[PDB]
Swiss-Prot record, chain A:
Predominantly expressed in monocytes and granulocytes. Expressed in neutrophils (at protein level). This is Integrin alpha-M. It is linked to Systemic lupus erythematosus 6: A chronic, relapsing, inflammatory, and often febrile multisystemic disorder of connective tissue, characterized principally by involvement of the skin, joints, kidneys and serosal membranes. It is of unknown etiology, but is thought to represent a failure of the regulatory mechanisms of the autoimmune system. The disease is marked by a wide range of system dysfunctions, an elevated erythrocyte sedimentation rate, and the formation of LE cells in the blood or bone marrow. It comes from the Eukaryota. It comes from Homo sapiens. Belongs to the integrin alpha chain family.
UniProtKB/Swiss-Prot annotation, chain B:
Secreted growth factor that mediates its signal through cell-surface proteoglycan and non-proteoglycan receptors. Binds cell-surface proteoglycan receptor via their chondroitin sulfate (CS) groups. Thereby regulates many processes like cell proliferation, cell survival, cell growth, cell differentiation and cell migration in several tissues namely neuron and bone. Also plays a role in synaptic plasticity and learning-related behavior by inhibiting long-term synaptic potentiation. One of its GO terms (cellular component) is Schaffer collateral - CA1 synapse. It comes from Homo sapiens (Human). The keyword Nucleus does not apply. This is Pleiotrophin. The gene is PTN. Belongs to the pleiotrophin family. Interacts with ALK and NEK6. Interacts with PTPRZ1 (via chondroitin sulfate groups); promotes formation of homooligomers; oligomerization impairs tyrosine phosphatase activity. Forms a complex with PTPRZ1 and CTNNB1; this complex inactivates PTPRZ1 protein tyrosine phosphatase activity through PTN interaction and stimulates tyrosine phosphorylation of CTNNB1. Interacts with ITGB3 and ITGA5. Forms a complex with PTPRZ1 and integrin alpha-V/beta-3 (ITGAV:ITGB3) that stimulates endothelial cell migration through ITGB3 'Tyr-773' phosphorylation. Residues 3-10, 34-42 are annotated as: Chondroitin sulfate binding. Coiled coil: none annotated.
Length: 184, 57
């Protein structure tokens, strides 16, 4: 009933430790929200964009641990805006495995700083909101310590941003999101 | 040479001055990145060459 896609920031500002946590988090999410009618997709980004598995591939091999294990860090700059636009056009495409009528949910796990991205959020948010793509932001590193990073997260997360922005170190957040996922 | 420099906003470590090239009469040192920041996605290594006469301006 729902199409969930994962977008993880793997720039140079991403410490291997936290990148690992991202992978662990994603796997735990796919192992916790393992429903008979739920597919997953994951695309990592930096200056480039690498899809590791589409909704179709996950439908062929429903092994989260096996799909997240070979995932390597890209490194480089950050393209959160350019990434969001690509996610709503390629990741959520029927050809890749996206279903019709099903809800669109995008989980964005960025470093907090979209540096080097030629596109702004104003160029991609109005697009993601039209296609009906719910946004959930998970902050890592110092994303909650800086003002610029905090507001950025609130610009990606669907309003109200407070109820859509969680910490990567917040384990209870998973139960919280899964809760709101009932009042979709 | 009309090339300036790179981003100095990153904490680098300049090691190895290397052998002086008796061809170009210059010497090249290597700078390695030891720590970056969120609002600063810097490179892992940099290279800088200077005259063997050791001129600094």
């Amino acid at each position: 009933d729902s199409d969930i896609a994962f977008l993880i920031d793997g720039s140079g500002s991403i410490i291997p430790h936290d990148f690992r946590r991202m992978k662990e988090f994603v796997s735990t999410v796919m192992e916790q929200l393992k429903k008979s009618k739920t597919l997953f997709s994951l695309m990592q980004y930096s200056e480039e964009f690498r899809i590791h598995f589409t909704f179709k591939e996950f439908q062929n091999n429903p092994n989260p641990r096996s799909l997240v294990k070979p995932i390597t860090q890209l490194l480089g700059r950050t393209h959160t805006a350019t990434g969001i636009r690509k996610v709503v056009r390629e990741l959520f495409n029927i050809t890749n495995g996206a279903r019709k009528n099903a809800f669109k949910i995008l989980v964005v796990i960025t470093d907090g700083e979209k540096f080097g991205d030629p596109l702004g959020y104003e160029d991609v948010i109005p697009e993601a909101d039209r296609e009906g793509v719910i946004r959930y932001v998970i902050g890592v590193g110092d994303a909650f310590r800086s003002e610029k990073s905090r507001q950025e997260l609130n610009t990606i997360a669907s309003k109200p941003p407070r109820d859509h922005v969680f910490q990567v170190n917040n384990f209870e957040a998973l139960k919280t999101i899964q809760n709101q996922l009932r009042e979709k | 040479n009309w090339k300036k420099q790179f981003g100095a906003e990153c904490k680098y470590q300049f090691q190895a001055w290397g052998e002086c090239d008796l061809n170009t009469a210059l010497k090249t040192r290597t700078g390695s990145l030891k720590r970056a920041l969120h609002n600063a996605e810097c490179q892992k290594t940099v290279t800088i060459s200077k005259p063997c006469g050791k001129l600094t301006k």
